[PDB]
Structure 1
Amino acid sequence: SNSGVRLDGYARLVQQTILCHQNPVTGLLPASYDQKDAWVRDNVYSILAVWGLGLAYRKNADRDEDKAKAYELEQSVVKLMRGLLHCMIRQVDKVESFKYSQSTKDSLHAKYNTKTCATVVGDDQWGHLQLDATSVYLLFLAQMTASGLHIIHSLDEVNFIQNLVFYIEAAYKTADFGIWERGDKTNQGISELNASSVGMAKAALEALDELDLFGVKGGPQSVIHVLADEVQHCQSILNSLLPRASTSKEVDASLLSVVSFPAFAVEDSQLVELTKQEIITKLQGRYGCCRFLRDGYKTPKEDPNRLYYEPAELKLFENIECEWPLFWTYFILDGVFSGNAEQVQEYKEALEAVLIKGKNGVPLLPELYSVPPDRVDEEYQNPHTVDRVPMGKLPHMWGQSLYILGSLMAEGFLAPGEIDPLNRRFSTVPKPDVVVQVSILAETEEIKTILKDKGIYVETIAEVYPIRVQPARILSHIYSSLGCNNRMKLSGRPYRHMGVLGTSKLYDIRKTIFTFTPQFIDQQQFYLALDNKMIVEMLRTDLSYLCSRWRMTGQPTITFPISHSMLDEDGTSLNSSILAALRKMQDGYFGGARVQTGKLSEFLTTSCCTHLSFMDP
């Protein structure tokens, strides 16, 4: 069959290009050239082509040769992921120490060595802070686990994954070195927040909400729980942080990795189109797109054997920046995934010309194109007019792997739903509406009698014995004991405040339904809870916030108890503000949300319930 001929041809190309450097014993390929070093992100991105080819081969089953090839590819990707996983285990102390007090001198080293899985660079000779690599590793591990592959093998592995997820969950308020490991335009030993990092972390957290690492045979003890507040905060930070690249960078081509096929961590498709148009206008060239404005990577000047560039780049690195075809490959993937056909054809036609042939006429993607030192003033005066020459790592496994995956997807041998079993392509589908449910509770019999006198039917704290109401500090303390193991010296999730998006969610502990009041009614913690107007106003704000995103499954449920500190001077009737708020509640409208008042038992029929297996004796 012609399809079989094309498949074996692609297998030959991938074997001659990437799989030839499989590096047995460990399974981590070198990062091209004479480097003898393994990058987590580079290996993870390179293994995508092998995973896609294995998925394509698995479809043509019922033959010994095809079955053997598919098994070999799957076991190869599994071996690579196990090697990277062992490398990550080799720094459990570093991860645990980073869990408290986030600092650049605490994160695991991004540069990992070859076989024997050791550290090749100390803690001060390189920037060992890259949340994007870890987040994309988690996302791809989740995607293949959902596909059917087995990678996680032990309970201690699940505990380590949970601890590392807790470590990466704080990416929205920390400064890292970014994908380029250089911070801002000037290195100067400075790190800053990056949109790519937070987007990747949010996507990894979302993709890892409930999934079981053990597959179908796994039980409730092998599931991983992630909070809802972190994902929404990351999404909000991304929304407020995407008119540009970062605080100092006006535009970066790495933003394409956030608003496209990799991790699909974006909404508001109009913003996506605007960002793509800005990137095209400010970065597109004759041999790919540039990284970002004012970059000095691989130039015929600025003393290449030097670091810590001084602020003297007024015009030295302007208009002569190198261009990377891997951005063209990313554009090809983005076009071929969602809905585009003509764009894919035009981008493939453009990319075919910049390709450089190799041994036996094998396609090879050059790392970058650089301007000749002689033709520099001409490029200054006439932008995008001079001709560049291919430099860098000629067998760039990153760009080559993405190009191979894009070609396989475009040829029709693979479907968009195979690489993404989690259905992340529909992340841009608008949400129609969500209805939030509220429950009104009475602290004492007098409160219930007063409410009944005012035409309000409520229930006291008693009579609901199957359900228990407790402050959110209790669930905070409970979640602080998640992923706790004494053998590998893991302290579990650090204690932290709990928002409103999870307190509304129902929790099942020891076969008992637990409902918790929101944390903002705690007068003991701080005194803003005393004021009536502040309480009703911020309750409206929280209701609005809950009604806005509500990314999680199921209906919500809010419990509002009536305390004795909210009564009038005589202590015989409720305050005017609270009474008006509850009257608006009964009318099914308050602020910008729709609510339906009812009983907790009625809401129990349809709501989001989470079971905590780690609390079992």
Structure 2
Amino acid sequence: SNSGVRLDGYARLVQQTILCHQNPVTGLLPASYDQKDAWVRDNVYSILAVWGLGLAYRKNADRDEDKAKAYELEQSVVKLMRGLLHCMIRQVDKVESFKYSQSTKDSLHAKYNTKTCATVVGDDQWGHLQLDATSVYLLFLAQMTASGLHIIHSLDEVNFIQNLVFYIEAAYKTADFGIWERGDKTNQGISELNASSVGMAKAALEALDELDLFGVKGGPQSVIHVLADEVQHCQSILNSLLPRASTSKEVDASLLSVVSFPAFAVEDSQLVELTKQEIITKLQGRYGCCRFLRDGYKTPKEDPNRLYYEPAELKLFENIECEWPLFWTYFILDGVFSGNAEQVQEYKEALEAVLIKGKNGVPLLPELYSVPPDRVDEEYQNPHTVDRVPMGKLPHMWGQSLYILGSLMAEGFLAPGEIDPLNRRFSTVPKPDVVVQVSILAETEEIKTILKDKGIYVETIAEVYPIRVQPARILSHIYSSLGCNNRMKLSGRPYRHMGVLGTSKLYDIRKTIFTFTPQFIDQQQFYLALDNKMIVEMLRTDLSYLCSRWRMTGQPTITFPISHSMLDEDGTSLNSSILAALRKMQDGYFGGARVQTGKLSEFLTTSCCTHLSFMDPGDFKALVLQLKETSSLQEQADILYMLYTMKGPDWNTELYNERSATVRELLTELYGKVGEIRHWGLIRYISGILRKKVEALDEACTDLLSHQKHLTVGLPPEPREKTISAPLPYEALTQLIDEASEGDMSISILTQEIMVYLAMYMRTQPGLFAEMFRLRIGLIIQVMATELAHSLRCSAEEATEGLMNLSPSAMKNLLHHILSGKQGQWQRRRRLDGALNRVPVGFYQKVWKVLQKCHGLSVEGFVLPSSTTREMTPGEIKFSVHVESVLNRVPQPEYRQLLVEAILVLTMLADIEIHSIGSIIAVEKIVHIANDLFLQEQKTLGADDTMLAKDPASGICTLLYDSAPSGRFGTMTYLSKAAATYVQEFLPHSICAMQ
């Protein structure tokens, strides 16, 4: 039959192309060419064609010979997978070290060796960080297991796999070198985040949710357990940065794999079409597509025998990116997968033209086509016109295997439902909504009586004996025993905080039912849970978030017990906000989701239940006297802090002759008394001594950084100020904040609170941060203090004391008011604008054009040479950083605003004329000329000397600051006149202005 002949031909091609270099015993193919190495990614990618051929053979075999062929192919695949797994399992120590902290020194090697599976290079001679390779390996291992190909034999391998799951679960906040093993855009590799790694890691975690590695004959302990919060975090990060591969590359062709056949992890299909169109319009060429703009690999320049590209890529790597037909061969698979046939035919026809025929006349895919060394000038003027020639190795196993698989699938022998048994092709199907279940419990009898008085029926913590409730930290500690082995030196999952997605579902532990309350009602960590309004806001946000995704099975469940702190001052009635929230929860509408209340007995019948199996059994004495006798929280805190600093870090004060009372114990006890008075004047002070830390701070910092913003901790001036341009570990962030805050102590707490509030507000309303590029906590705090002082018309110390006493809700309201933006008026507005340096939305583009028509812009000695225009691009961040640095030399915010206005008016005027100044422009001279003209004009009118005052250290009249921007007497007209005069001063006696 025709099918048999086609299968025989494809098998012959595969045997002659890939299987000829399987390297028996080890089972790992060489990494192409005469390199004598085995890259993990290529080995995984090169098996898909063989797997598909075997799958096609199996169904139609019905014969002994076909049975033998299928058995041999399956055995080869299993052998390769086991050989790959051996190398990883030989390096358990590296995984164990990496589980704690994040560093490149404790990372698994990316290039393993041939026979004996040893190491070839050290830890300082290559980029040993690639989270995508392990992710794709795990994804394909999970996919193959469902097919029916055994790859796991011993139970010990299960523990190693479980530990490895924790090795990649932190991919949403970990920097990696990248798929190309070249760090960021330029050379001199610096770790940076990219969308491809997170996209590939997200798919792997979902696949292994409940897939047992023992097939249909497993046991109670054979399934890998994974969480859900990490998947949602990865999805959010991918959605935020989907259009751009990273913060340094405008677009990368590697996103196709993330949004194509392998590891479908994308929603909002419009994004897929947008990115595909962008890639097609930007990177498409004549004989392939480029990886990314300005890559100099295999170029007639760059001195191939040298590395660490010098910062001289002005135009030596422009419009000469060679090619990569792999991005072309991905398109055929992408089109043929879902519903596309005309696109498949078009891409097949396009690819057939760029093929090369070698020995025996069989398909062969070249790596790239290099531009001729002579015809280089023409390309700069006529891009994508000059013919190219092949260059580099072309035994490309990756592209060849992908093309063979695509052709076989298009032939119709195999269907899309066989390669992906997990049904990952239906990720674009919308899900309508979910219904949230909420249960309310009373801490004691009194709370129950109060609730019943107002018509709310609940049950106390008792009377539900068969069910039990406890905090979430207990669950987090319990989870720290999964996949723990002593012989192999594995410590199990590290401790981490638990989100709402984990606490909602029910649990089973030794024939028992357990429920864990949310983490935000914990008063033993911080004081953010002591405010009822904050509790309500967090509850609403949590309800909305839970109702949004809920990608699990079964309705959710939330327990919200009412504690003693939720009562009024008299302790006889719940607060108004709590009652309103409880009433709104009824009637099936609260926040932005439907909420249904009842009793746990009914919810038990319809609710997700998780079965846990791993838990089954296998003179200071005078000062102390003064503290005891003295009263007042101020004196108590002062003496306690002094004792702790001097001699009482852990020493026993001996205050009680019976009980040994340590300084820490007394400080902890003082919280109980402080919490009743709600005195927000020393609760922060005591928190400083204990040095409490906010959980999930790293997540907030990563979220802030992912929005293309630069953080900053520490008040001015430099070098105290820092710059957190990349994510840092929790300990690193805490120590950096402590160092920046110096001994102020309270500054650290204020900074943490401000960061938390900013992270919270960013998600809801990501529109108020426009016109801003750098965030500075010290400047924000100073602005808040100054605003409070002006409002109260008091001294700076009084304003600081008042700010310290503000409740969290008041602080959030003040921050929102400051951000929104809502003599003495115009000067205040200018000062506020200058402090936050809210530049317009297109300042940098205008600055770059003008530079394009002048020699620079000098600002009090410092000069911004125009040569930087060709060394950078307006979209890059280096140019913006340099511009801000040049503009920030002057300390007065009013001067900064005046300079910004002068630059803008100069840019607007430059359009009218058609000429090149060919000279350096000084903004300060223009400003001074405008000020002199305004002074003369006011003097001519007849204003008395009192109105025309002079600044103490600026030389500019105060009225100028108060003058309105526009109008027939505003500062814009004076600035324009001064700029015109200055331009005329350096013009060849002619303007020729025409528009």
For the aligned pair, the TM-score class normalised by the smaller chain equals over 0.9
Counterpart CA distance in 1 for 2:375 and 2:291 is 21
Counterpart CA distance in 2 for 1:270 and 1:531 is 41
Counterpart CA distance in 2 for 1:394 and 1:449 is 80
Moved more, 180-189 or 559-568: 180-189
Deviation string 1:336-364 (CA, Å, 9 cap, x unpaired) is 11111111111111111111111100101
Counterpart CA distance in 2 for 1:553 and 1:135 is 25
Structure 2 contact 38–114 (Cα < 8 Å) conserved: yes
Deviation string 1:89-141 (CA, Å, 9 cap, x unpaired) is 11110011000011111110011111111111111100000000000000000
Counterpart CA distance in 2 for 1:224 and 1:157 is 11
Deviation string 1:441-460 (CA, Å, 9 cap, x unpaired) is 11111111211111111121
Deviation string 1:165-188 (CA, Å, 9 cap, x unpaired) is 101000000100110011111121
Once the two structures are TM-superposed, the CA of residue 36 in structure 1 deviates from its matched residue by 0.6
Structure 2 contact 177–189 (Cα < 8 Å) conserved: no
The residue correspondences of 1:78-117 to structure 2 (distance < 5 A) are 78-117=78-117
Once the two structures are TM-superposed, the CA of residue 466 in structure 1 deviates from its matched residue by 2.0
Deviation string 1:264-310 (CA, Å, 9 cap, x unpaired) is 01111100110111111111111111101111111111011121111
Once the two structures are TM-superposed, the CA of residue 189 in structure 1 deviates from its matched residue by 2.5
Once the two structures are TM-superposed, the CA of residue 228 in structure 1 deviates from its matched residue by 0.5
Once the two structures are TM-superposed, the CA of residue 609 in structure 1 deviates from its matched residue by 1.4
Once the two structures are TM-superposed, the CA of residue 560 in structure 1 deviates from its matched residue by 0.7
Structure 2 residue matching 1:469: 3-state secondary structure: strand
Provide the residue aligned with 1:590 in structure 2.
590
Counterpart CA distance in 1 for 2:601 and 2:187 is 59
Provide the residue aligned with 1:510 in structure 2.
510
Once the two structures are TM-superposed, the CA of residue 247 in structure 1 deviates from its matched residue by 0.7
Once the two structures are TM-superposed, the CA of residue 315 in structure 1 deviates from its matched residue by 1.1
Once the two structures are TM-superposed, the CA of residue 464 in structure 1 deviates from its matched residue by 1.6
Counterpart CA distance in 2 for 1:391 and 1:19 is 25
* Higher RCO structure (Cα 8 Å, ≥6 apart): 1
Once the two structures are TM-superposed, the CA of residue 243 in structure 1 deviates from its matched residue by 2.0
Structure 1 residue matching 2:427: 3-state secondary structure: helix
Once the two structures are TM-superposed, the CA of residue 583 in structure 1 deviates from its matched residue by 0.7
Counterpart CA distance in 1 for 2:524 and 2:160 is 36
With normalisation by structure 2, the TM-score equals 0.61
Counterpart CA distance in 1 for 2:561 and 2:237 is 32
Once the two structures are TM-superposed, the CA of residue 553 in structure 1 deviates from its matched residue by 2.2
Unmatched tracts of structure 1, length 5 or more: none
Moved more, 517-526 or 505-514: 505-514
Once the two structures are TM-superposed, the CA of residue 393 in structure 1 deviates from its matched residue by 2.1
Counterpart CA distance in 2 for 1:510 and 1:290 is 58
Moved more, 546-555 or 273-282: 546-555
Once the two structures are TM-superposed, the CA of residue 314 in structure 1 deviates from its matched residue by 1.5
Once the two structures are TM-superposed, the CA of residue 24 in structure 1 deviates from its matched residue by 0.6
Counterpart CA distance in 1 for 2:35 and 2:607 is 54
Structure 2 contact 553–608 (Cα < 8 Å) conserved: yes
Deviation string 1:548-602 (CA, Å, 9 cap, x unpaired) is 1112222211111111111001111111111111111112111111111121121
Matched, 1:35 2:38: no
Counterpart CA distance in 1 for 2:591 and 2:310 is 53
Once the two structures are TM-superposed, the CA of residue 329 in structure 1 deviates from its matched residue by 1.2
Counterpart CA distance in 2 for 1:52 and 1:314 is 47
**Aligned residues: percent identity?**
100
Aligned pair count reads 615
Once the two structures are TM-superposed, the CA of residue 474 in structure 1 deviates from its matched residue by 0.7
Moved more, 600-609 or 395-404: 600-609
Once the two structures are TM-superposed, the CA of residue 611 in structure 1 deviates from its matched residue by 1.3
Larger Rg: 2
Structure 2 residue matching 1:514: 3-state secondary structure: strand
Once the two structures are TM-superposed, the CA of residue 433 in structure 1 deviates from its matched residue by 0.8
Structure 2 residue matching 1:288: 3-state secondary structure: coil
Structure 1 contact 26–114 (Cα < 8 Å) conserved: yes
Counterpart CA distance in 1 for 2:318 and 2:511 is 65
Moved more, 228-237 or 549-558: 549-558
Structure 2 residue matching 1:596: 3-state secondary structure: strand
Moved more, 447-456 or 403-412: 447-456
Provide the residue aligned with 1:399 in structure 2.
399
Deviation string 1:239-280 (CA, Å, 9 cap, x unpaired) is 001121101000000000111111001111100110111111
Counterpart CA distance in 2 for 1:84 and 1:499 is 35
Structure 1 contact 470–515 (Cα < 8 Å) conserved: yes
The residue correspondences of 1:261-340 to structure 2 (distance < 5 A) are 261-340=261-340
Once the two structures are TM-superposed, the CA of residue 404 in structure 1 deviates from its matched residue by 0.6
Q: Aligned-pair RMSD on alpha carbons?
A: 0.9
Provide the residue aligned with 2:171 in structure 1.
171
Provide the residue aligned with 1:16 in structure 2.
16
The residue correspondences of 1:122-137 to structure 2 (distance < 5 A) are 122-137=122-137
Structure 1 residue matching 2:558: 3-state secondary structure: strand
Provide the residue aligned with 1:614 in structure 2.
614
More helix by share: 2
Structure 2 residue matching 1:62: 3-state secondary structure: coil
Once the two structures are TM-superposed, the CA of residue 499 in structure 1 deviates from its matched residue by 0.6
Structure 2 contact 127–181 (Cα < 8 Å) conserved: yes
Once the two structures are TM-superposed, the CA of residue 369 in structure 1 deviates from its matched residue by 1.5
Structure 1 contact 448–460 (Cα < 8 Å) conserved: yes
Structure 1 contact 182–191 (Cα < 8 Å) conserved: no
Deviation string 1:144-181 (CA, Å, 9 cap, x unpaired) is 01111111112111100010010100000010011001
Deviation string 1:409-455 (CA, Å, 9 cap, x unpaired) is 11111111111111110111111111111111111111112111111
Moved more, 136-145 or 589-598: 589-598
Moved more, 160-169 or 305-314: 305-314
Provide the residue aligned with 1:258 in structure 2.
258
Deviation string 1:388-407 (CA, Å, 9 cap, x unpaired) is 11222211000000001111
Provide the residue aligned with 2:485 in structure 1.
485
Structure 2 contact 506–607 (Cα < 8 Å) conserved: yes
Matched, 1:553 2:553: yes
Counterpart CA distance in 1 for 2:53 and 2:530 is 62
Counterpart CA distance in 2 for 1:553 and 1:569 is 43
Deviation string 1:23-81 (CA, Å, 9 cap, x unpaired) is 11110101110011001110100111111111111111320111111111111111100
Moved more, 551-560 or 7-16: 551-560
Counterpart CA distance in 2 for 1:377 and 1:331 is 32
With normalisation by structure 1, the TM-score equals 0.99
Structure 1 residue matching 2:183: 3-state secondary structure: coil
Counterpart CA distance in 2 for 1:612 and 1:183 is 42
Structure 2 residue matching 1:133: 3-state secondary structure: helix
Structure 1 segments of 4+ aligned residues over 2 angstroms from their partners:
none
Structure 1 contact 417–423 (Cα < 8 Å) conserved: yes
Structure 2 residue matching 1:289: 3-state secondary structure: coil
Once the two structures are TM-superposed, the CA of residue 613 in structure 1 deviates from its matched residue by 1.2
Structure 1 residue matching 2:433: 3-state secondary structure: coil
Structure 2 residue matching 1:496: 3-state secondary structure: coil
Structure 1 contact 368–391 (Cα < 8 Å) conserved: yes
Structure 2 residue matching 1:328: 3-state secondary structure: helix
Counterpart CA distance in 1 for 2:390 and 2:461 is 74
Counterpart CA distance in 2 for 1:442 and 1:54 is 62
Structure 2 residue matching 1:511: 3-state secondary structure: coil
Once the two structures are TM-superposed, the CA of residue 543 in structure 1 deviates from its matched residue by 0.8
Once the two structures are TM-superposed, the CA of residue 508 in structure 1 deviates from its matched residue by 1.2
Moved more, 124-133 or 318-327: 318-327
Once the two structures are TM-superposed, the CA of residue 468 in structure 1 deviates from its matched residue by 1.4
Provide the residue aligned with 2:425 in structure 1.
425
Structure 2 contact 470–517 (Cα < 8 Å) conserved: yes
Once the two structures are TM-superposed, the CA of residue 328 in structure 1 deviates from its matched residue by 1.0
Structure 2 residue matching 1:253: 3-state secondary structure: coil
Counterpart CA distance in 2 for 1:217 and 1:513 is 28
Counterpart CA distance in 1 for 2:355 and 2:230 is 42
Counterpart CA distance in 2 for 1:209 and 1:12 is 38
Structure 1 contact 507–609 (Cα < 8 Å) conserved: yes
